[PDB]
């Protein structure tokens, strides 16, 4: 059954985060199934030292100890412009305040991103609170070639577990791309990660510059879902 669903409006999204000259908003032109699908874009500036998210924000999307499927399709602009740099484009993360480790408390634990033309992901594990940050990040490249133009459909099967006991599983246009059993998929605690999807082109800060020419980057979203079956979350089934 599913217990989140969006056909790519902005109704029914907790936040949307929009950050510098960021966009997000409803269109009916690019669109995957119906008549609406959301579009992010993020403009790189010269000279800013903050940050570039495109997002729309589902706060309920995980604790440790479950089991949930999650499905998005999204598209690159036709013109994309392949980059060695990430651009982001879904992760899950939960502000843990007081936990002490690193910059903030906000932690992101699996994200999914572009670097070059291939979709990357990974997961996060150990316990990074004071007085340990010890963490482990798994990251698990080349998960699919990724084109652009072109409306792709991603579907997570994962159980949150800091015991060798979860999983961590991917498909990627109807096809199973990634699998792997008794992993640990989370850190030892019981925060509540929110399920974010959109552009964060987060190199063009983590690395201070951005490579090659496109400033102006551009991804749609839509057919979001998180539930407990794969048919519950596929963008490419009712
Ligand atoms: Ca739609």
């Given at each position: 059954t599913r217990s989140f669903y969006n056909?790519?409006?902005?109704?029914?999204?907790?936040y949307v985060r929009k950050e510098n000259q960021g966009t997000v908003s409803e269109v009916?032109?690019?669109?995957?199934?119906?008549?609406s699908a959301l579009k992010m874009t993020q403009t790189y500036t010269p000279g800013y030292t903050g940050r570039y998210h495109s997002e729309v924000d589902h706060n309920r999307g995980y604790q440790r100890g479950e089991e949930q499927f999650y499905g998005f399709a999204f598209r690159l602009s036709e013109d994309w412009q392949f980059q060695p740099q990430s651009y982001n484009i879904a992760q899950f993360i939960a502000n843990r305040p007081g936990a002490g480790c690193g910059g903030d408390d906000w932690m992101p634990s699996t994200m999914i991103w572009i670097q070059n033309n291939q979709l990357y992901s990974r997961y996060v594990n150990g316990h990074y609170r004071q007085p340990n940050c010890g963490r482990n990040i798994v990251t698990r490249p080349n998960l699919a070639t990724v084109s652009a133009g072109a409306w792709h459909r991603v579907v997570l099967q994962i159980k949150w577990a800091s015991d060798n006991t979860g999983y961590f599983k991917i498909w990627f246009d109807g096809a199973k791309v990634h699998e792997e059993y008794n992993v640990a998929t989370t850190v030892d605690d019981d925060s509540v990660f929110q399920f974010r999807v959109g552009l964060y082109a987060n190199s063009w800060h983590d690395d201070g510059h951005m490579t090659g020419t496109q400033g102006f980057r551009q991804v749609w979203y839509d057919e979001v879902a998180v539930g407990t079956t794969f048919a519950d979350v596929d963008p490419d089934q009712a």
């Open positions: 056909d790519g409006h902005l109704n029914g999204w907790d009916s032109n690019v669109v995957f199934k119906g008549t």
